[PDB]
Structure formats: structure tokens, C-alpha cells
Amino acid sequence: MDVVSLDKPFMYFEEIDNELDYEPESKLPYQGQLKLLLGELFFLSKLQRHGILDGATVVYIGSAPGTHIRYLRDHFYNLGVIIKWMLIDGRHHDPILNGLRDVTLVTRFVDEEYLRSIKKQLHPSKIILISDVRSEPSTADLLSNYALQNVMISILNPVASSLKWRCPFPDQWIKDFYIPHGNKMLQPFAPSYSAEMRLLSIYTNMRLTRVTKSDAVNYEKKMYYLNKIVRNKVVINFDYPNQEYDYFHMYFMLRTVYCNKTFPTTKAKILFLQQSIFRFLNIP
Numbered sequence: 661m662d663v664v665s666l667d668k669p670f671m672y673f674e675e676i677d678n679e680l681d682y683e684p685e686s687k688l689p690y691q692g693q694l695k696l697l698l699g700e701l702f703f704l705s706k707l708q709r710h711g712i713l714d715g716a717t718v719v720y721i722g723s724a725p726g727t728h729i730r731y732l733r734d735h736f737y738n739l740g741v742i743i744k745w746m747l748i749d750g751r752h753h754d755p756i757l758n759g760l761r762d763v764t765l766v767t768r769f770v771d772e773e774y775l776r777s778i779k780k781q782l783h784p785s786k787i788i789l790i791s792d793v794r795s796e797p798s799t800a801d802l803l804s805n806y807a808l809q810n811v812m813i814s815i816l817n818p819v820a821s822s823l824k825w826r827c828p829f830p831d832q833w834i835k836d837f838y839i840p841h842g843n844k845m846l847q848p849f850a851p852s853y854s855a856e857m858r859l860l861s862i863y864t865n866m867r868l869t870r871v872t873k874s875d876a877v878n879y880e881k882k883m884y885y886l887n888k889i890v891r892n893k894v895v896i897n898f899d900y901p902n903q904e905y906d907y908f909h910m911y912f913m914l915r916t917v918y919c920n921k922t923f924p925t926t927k928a929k930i931l932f933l934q935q936s937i938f939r940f941l942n943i944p
């Protein structure tokens with residue numbers, strides 16, 4: 661691999677400072693669950709900092725199988741953060757999520773009508789929304805997914821939200837569509853050439869923004885450069901057992917996390933955290 665020297669990785673899509681023409685030419689065990697757990701630990705730990713997580717109910721739509729969620733719940737539980745978890749999915753969840761009084765498992769495909777019923781039952785408690793719903797998917801599938809996610813926000817009115825965000829590819833465009841305002845958080849350990857990110861919103865009332873076909877091209881080119889060039893560098897100045905970019909990226913995400921244990925160095929804290937995550941997910 662190519663070596664490089666960085667002060668920080670790209671955390672949000674806007675920071676990508678170069679593009680590359682997509683080329684059609686296209687590793688870790690349970691990498692999907694690792695990718696989710698990191699982005700959700702990041703998003704939730706940022707809510708912990710703003711003090712809006714304590715006393716909240718996390719509503720996770722499309723959570724099945726959700727093996728990683730058991731690590732989230734344990735993490736904040738051991739931190740003393742009071743959280744209620746409600747995991748709603750058509751498919752069955754990982755049985756590792758069984759027997760937890762603060763985790764409610766719901767087997768159902770959410771529609772507008774049901775979204776109103778869970779809002780009425782949770783109101784006026786703080787709701788935090790996490791959506792990973794997906795119906796390969798077509799641009800029509802994505803458009804329906806993103807329309808449902810919008811309905812999620814307008815009805816559930818969460819204090820904050822994390823939404824699956826992958827723009828349709830320009831050569832599969834259909835129409836302009838709208839998505840919420842938010843920060844486009846990049847995902848370490850995503851599939852080699854995935855252009856998917858997490859749209860993180862903290863609502864002060866939401867505002868929608870139009871996504872055009874020229875935006876689809878910007879996404880394609882920036883994500884390709886990120887996946888082809890950036891994510892294939894070794895950060896030679898980084899002080900860590902593994903210097904590959906994705907670990908550099910993971911490192912910066914993990915240092916926002918809270919810990920009950922005290923460590924002599926930030927590096928020791930990240931190292932302990934990374935091992936704990938990997939051991940639970942069965943990753944060498």
C-alpha cells in the first residue's frame with residue numbers, strides 16, 4: 661500500500677478534497693456489524709456529550725439482526741446512562757438481544773400508521789431515531805426508503821437521528837428527491853467501494869434539502885476517490901498497532917466515546933475499546 665502522513669482523517673463527506681472517475685472493477689469477518697457499531701457509538705456518544713442522550717428512548721428501525729446493538733446497550737448501561745431501546749424490524753433479531761428489560765424487540769414492518777402509534781405511546785419522552793432500513797436495490801427502492809425515513813422524522817419528531825444515506829447512482833437517476841439537513845458522517849470499515857454514509861441530525865424543527873443528479877455525480881466521484889485512494893493509504897505517522905487508514909479513521913471516532921475505566925493514555929483507551937469491540941464481534 662501507499663504511505664501517507666495525516667493529522668486527521670476525513671470525518672464528514674464535505675472534507676473529501678478530491679475526486680476520481682468511478683471504475684466498475686469491483687475482507688473482515690462481520691464487517692457490517694463493525695461498521696454499524698462504530699457509527700452508532702459515534703453518533704450516540706456525541707449525543708451523550710450534548711447531554712441529550714440521558715433519559716432518551718432509542719428507536720432503531722431496521723435493526724434486525726442487530727448483533728452489534730447488544731454492545732451498544734451494554735456500553736451505555738455500564739456507563740449509567742438511562743436509555744430505553746426499541747428495535748423494530750420485519751425480520752427476527754439476533755437472540756443475543758434476549759432477556760434485556762430495557763430492550764424491547766418488535767417484529768413488524770413500520771408504516772405511517774404504526775409510526776403514529778409508537779409516537780403516541782412514547783410521547784412526551786425524548787426519542788432518538790436510528791434507521792438502517794433497506795428494501796441490490798433499485799433507485800425506486802432507495803427513493804421509497806428515503807421517503808419512509810422522512811416520514812419517520814416528521815411523525816416521530818426525534819431530538820436527533822441517524823439515517824442511512826447513499827445517493828442513487830447518476831446513471832440510475834429518476835427524479836430529484838429531498839432529505840433532511842444533517843452531517844454526512846463517513847463510515848470506516850464500510851464495503852471496499854461503498855458510497856453509503858450516515859446522515860446525523862440534531863434538530864433545534866427539520867429542514868429538507870433537494871438532491872439533484874449533479875449531486876449524485878459529486879457523490880460518486882468523491883466516494884470513489886475516498887475508497888480507491890484514501891482508504892488504501894497507511895498513515896505512517898500514526899501511533900497504533902495497525903496503521904491502515906480505516907484504523908486511523910476508527911481511532912478518531914473511538915476517542916469521542918466515554919469509558920468507566922481510566923487509562924494512562926488516550927492510545928490505551930482506544931486500544932482497550934477496539935479490542936473489546938473486536939472480541940465481541942469475533943474479529944481477530
Ligand SMILES: Nc1ncnc2c1ncn2[C@@H]1O[C@H](CSCC[C@H](N)C(=O)O)[C@@H](O)[C@H]1O
Nearest residue numbers: 722723724725726749750769770792793794
Ligand atoms: N418498513 C420497514 N420496517 C422495518 N424494518 C424494515 C423496513 N424495511 C426494511 N426493513 C429492514 O431493513 C433491514 C436492512 S439491513 C439492517 C441491518 C441491521 N441494522 C443490523 O444491525 O444488522 C432489514 O432487516 C429489513 O427487514
